[PDB]
Design a protein around this nucleic acid. Sequence first.
RNA 1: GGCCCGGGGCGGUUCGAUUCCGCCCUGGGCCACC
Length: 437
Amino acid sequence: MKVEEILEKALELVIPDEEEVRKGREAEEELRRRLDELGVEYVFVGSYARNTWLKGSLEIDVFLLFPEEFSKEELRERGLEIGKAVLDSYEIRYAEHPYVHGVVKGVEVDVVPCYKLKEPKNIKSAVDRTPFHHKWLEGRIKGKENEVRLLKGFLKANGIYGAEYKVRGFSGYLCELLIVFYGSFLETVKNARRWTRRTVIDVAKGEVRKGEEFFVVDPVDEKRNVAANLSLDNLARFVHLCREFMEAPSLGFFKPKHPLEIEPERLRKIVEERGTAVFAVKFRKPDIVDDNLYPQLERASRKIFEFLERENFMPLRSAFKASEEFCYLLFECQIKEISRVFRRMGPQFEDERNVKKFLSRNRAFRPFIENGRWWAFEMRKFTTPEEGVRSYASTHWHTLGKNVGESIREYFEIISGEKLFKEPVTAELCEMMGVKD
RNA sequence: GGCCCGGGGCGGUUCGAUUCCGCCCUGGGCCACC
């Protein structure tokens, strides 16, 4: 188990099995013939065209090249039309840029429309840079695609491989830039231990300089941060993972971490031991794309957590879970119950203009003097975290995300105790409380 | 849809709000869906 050896066994986990390779080639060729029959301009790109797709994550990306002059509406209608007559079956679901996902002879295919530009300067559709990335990458990644897969399986096996809002990790494209820059998976991990939240990797200039935030500048467009959606906490989890791996080189870093099957009974006893307040906000899942849902779930979660902290329920952490039916906003606090009364800080005895206005308010306890200023005893309209959330959510639904918020406006409940462990959140709850074993 | 920066109208809470909780407009970026 000496790094170097562990990487030899690892390839067996990230390199695609010759059967899968054929399957993909067999499909790519078919895809070609179907599109030629239509005689449309296209180009294969991504993991497949560069043969750097992670074993088991096969998916072809065909790109329909359209004239800069065409409407975005024209791309949507023409694009989807073509992709539909080209796939065995399809599925159309996207957040902003229209494309068709489907299957041809078994492999997953992404038929995406985009404008054929000259220079990836001022892109007109969200994806216009991909083809230029392919040209920039095909000549330089050649011979190091296995190195890309180690990295991809590494990030994947540790939950930070995707770059979409659900993951907020490293994009496949980022992975390939890191390899072209550092030269290998090992070199990347060796240096990633020294990355900070200000590290700027400039592939084009071949340099690493300190900056504002973590910025991996695109060879294709200097104003573009390739690691733009990589959360701070994930950059941290990676760096830390790189440090551990170099010290305890084990091929467990490439294996999909434990499935975790904890007993809903073991959990309840832990909560009892923690003596904290744990509960979720349950509402119906909005029929919308993951890329729209999660940012909203992060917002609702945060907006409620922030309410709980300023209201003194001493929040610990929050997490969210979205099943196919509902969504869950999870919380844990330190104050299961607070008092009715609390102090409110008034003016200093000095200026009376305000001292008087302060004491004029009909209070139930009569204000007192402490250290130079007046204080008042006030009563809260709720004494538990649940009560607070119930009030808050019912009253601030609109602010908890456009879609999430509207749903909560039409329904939401607060689950606690046993009734909460029956729900599909026992996995996120453990993760939240740092329960080990 | 989310984030960031800026204009203008407001409501609530507070002795005291541009400054705390929010609501309408509105201008410009950026990100995720490839």
